[model samples]
Target: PMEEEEVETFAFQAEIAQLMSLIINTFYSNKEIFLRELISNSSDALDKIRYESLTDPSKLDSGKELHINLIPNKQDRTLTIVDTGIGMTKADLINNLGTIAKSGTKAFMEALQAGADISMIGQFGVGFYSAYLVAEKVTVITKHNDDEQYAWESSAGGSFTVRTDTGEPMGRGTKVILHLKEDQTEYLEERRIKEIVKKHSQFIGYPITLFVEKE
Candidate 1:
C-alpha cells in the first residue's frame, strides 16, 4: 500500500496501562463521570479554536461558531459526540489521546509505582480514555486546518491505531464515537443523556445539542 494509506498502530506509553487504572480508580469513582470529563474536553477544544481564530481568522471560516452535538445511535449502540472546535492533527492525536499524563508521565508513573497518592501531584484532566470504562471501542475522527481528516481507534487494550479518514470529510473539528458496552445502553437513551448534560454542563459556554433518531 502507499504511504498515506498506511494505518499506524502503536502500543501506548509503557506505563499507560497502570496510569489508566491509577487515574480511573482514584479520580473517576463512577462510570458516568466520564461524560462530565468529555464535556470539559470540548470546552478546551472550543476555547483553543476561538483563540486561534483571533489571530488566524481563516480557522473561523469553518471551525468557528463553537458548539457540540451529542448523537446517540441506538441502532449501532454508539454515542457519538461531535464538536465544532479545534480538531487535532495526527501528531496531536498521538500526543493527546495516546498518553494519559504526558505533562508528568514519568512522575506519575514513578508515583504510582511508589504507591504514593497521585492526587497530591496536581490536578488531572481525564480525557478520551475515561470513556473506556463504559465503551468497548472508541473511534475519533478529526480534521484540523493543518492536516487532512484522520481517525483514531482504540480498544484501550494497551494499544491504539490511527489512520487516514477515507470516509466523509469534516471541514474542521472532531467527532468522538463511543461504542457502548452491553451494560451501557442507558447512554443511548435521549433522556439519560439530556439529564447528564443538564446536570454536569448546564453553565457550559457552548451549546450541547442531542440528535435523537426516530425510527
Candidate 2:
C-alpha cells in the first residue's frame, strides 16, 4: 500500500486576493439579485451546453437531458439551483471557483479601484460566486453522466470542501443548495423566485422546475 502524502494550499496571489475581496463585496447592491444572477447563469449554462451538444452528444456524456431545476426550501429558507447540463468536477470547482480568474471579476475589481459602482459585474459563466452574497452556506450535489456523484460545499469567506454524494444522484445533473442569509429571506418566497426566473430565464433552452411546498 502507498502512504498518503500531504497536499499544500497557498494563499491567493496578492493582487488576486485583493481582486477577490473587491469583486465579492461590490458585485450586488441587493442580496436578492443573487437569485436573478443565478437563474441567468443556469439558463446560459444550459444554452451553452445544449448548443455544444447539438454538435457533440458527448457534452452530457451519453445523451442526458439538458435542463435546470430550482428547488427552494421555505422551512430552511434555502434555494437549490440544479442543472442537467455539463457538470463540473472537483478540479473545475477549485480552479474556476477557488480563485478569482474570471475576466469580469478582474474588470469589476479594476473598475472599483477606479471608483465605479461595481454592481455591473455581469459576466455569466464566472459570476456564479456572487451567489455567496445572499447565501451564508452553499452545497452542490452533482453527477456526471460519465462519473460518480459528488458534492461541493463552501461558506464563501474562504476555502471549500467536497465529497462524494452518499447515494447515487438520480441522474446526471448538478444541484446547488443555498442556505439563505437573514437578509435574503425573500428568495424563499416562491412568487419572488418565479418572477425572477420568468424575467431572466423564460427563454432558456431547458425546462426549469421549482419544487415548492403547497402549504
Candidate 3:
C-alpha cells in the first residue's frame, strides 16, 4: 500500500472554474474523450523522455521500461493511466494543472460559442480537463529525477490539493487515476478501451498496454 501525504489544497483560477463548468455539463459531449486526452499526454511525456535520453542517457537509468499502461479496476471503479516518461516536479503540477492560459480559456469559450468541433482542444493545452467528463475525482502522482515524488488531486469542485507522496515511489513517470462516475461503468470494458487506444493512439511510438485481469 502507498503511504500517506501531508496535503496542501490550492484554489483554481477562474479559467479552471469556467472550464470545469463547461466540461462537466456539456462542452465535451463525448465521455470517451478522457481516454483520448490522457493517453496522448502519456505519449507526449514518453516522447520527451526518449528524446532527452539521447543526450544525457542517464535519464533512462531507472531501468523501468518506457511504456504506457492502462489499468482498470472493476471493483474500485477506477481507471489508471501510467507512463514511464519525463516526469514533473511539484511546481510543474501546480502550474500545469492549476492554471489555464488566458488565450486557451478565451479560445475555448469562443470555440464553444462558434459551434466548431472541439476535438482540437488539446492543442490549447486544456485537454486534461476532459477527465472530468467521466470522473468525479482525479489523482495524479508523478516523479522526476531532480525532485521528490508528489501527488496532485482534484474533484473539479473548486480546488485541487498537492502533497509529497511517501509511497513506493515510481522510478520516474506520471500516473493518473480517475474515479469514474456511477454511470460511466462501460469504460471498464476491454473491448471499448482497446478499440479507443487502437483508434486514437495506434501510431504512438511508445507501446500502450491495457492490462487484463483474468476472469
Best by TM-score: 3
How well is each residue in 44-112 modelled by candidate 3, as lDDT tens digits? Answer: 888888889999988888655789999999989999999998989898898888853546877886787
Instruction: Sort all candidates by TM-score, best to worst.
Output: 3, 1, 2
Top-lDDT structure, candidate number? 3
Question: Scored by Cα lDDT, where does model 2 land?
Answer: 0.65
Task: Please report how far candidate 3 places residue 191 from its true position, in Å.
Answer: 0.7
Error of 2 at 176 (Å): 0.9
The 10-residue segment with the lowest total lDDT in model 1? 117-126
Q: Which residue runs of candidate 1 sit more than 4 Å off their true CA positions?
A: 1-4, 21-29, 99-122
Q: What TM-score quantifies how close candidate 1 is to the native fold?
A: 0.84
Candidate 1: pairs in clash: none
Quote the positional error of residue 81 for candidate 1 in Å.
Answer: 0.3
Model 1 over residues 140-195: C-alpha lDDT tens digits? 99998879999999877688999999999887899999999888899999888888
Please write out the lDDT profile of model 2 over residues 1-215, one tens digit for every residue: 97553333434434445554554565456445566666666666567667777897766564467767777787888888877756666565556555545545566666667776434545523456567677778777766555767777776555566665675555665677899878778887889888877765566666878888887
List per-prediction Cα lDDT, in the order shown. 0.78, 0.65, 0.84
TM-score of every candidate: 0.84, 0.77, 0.92
| TM-score of model 2 (CA atoms) | 0.77
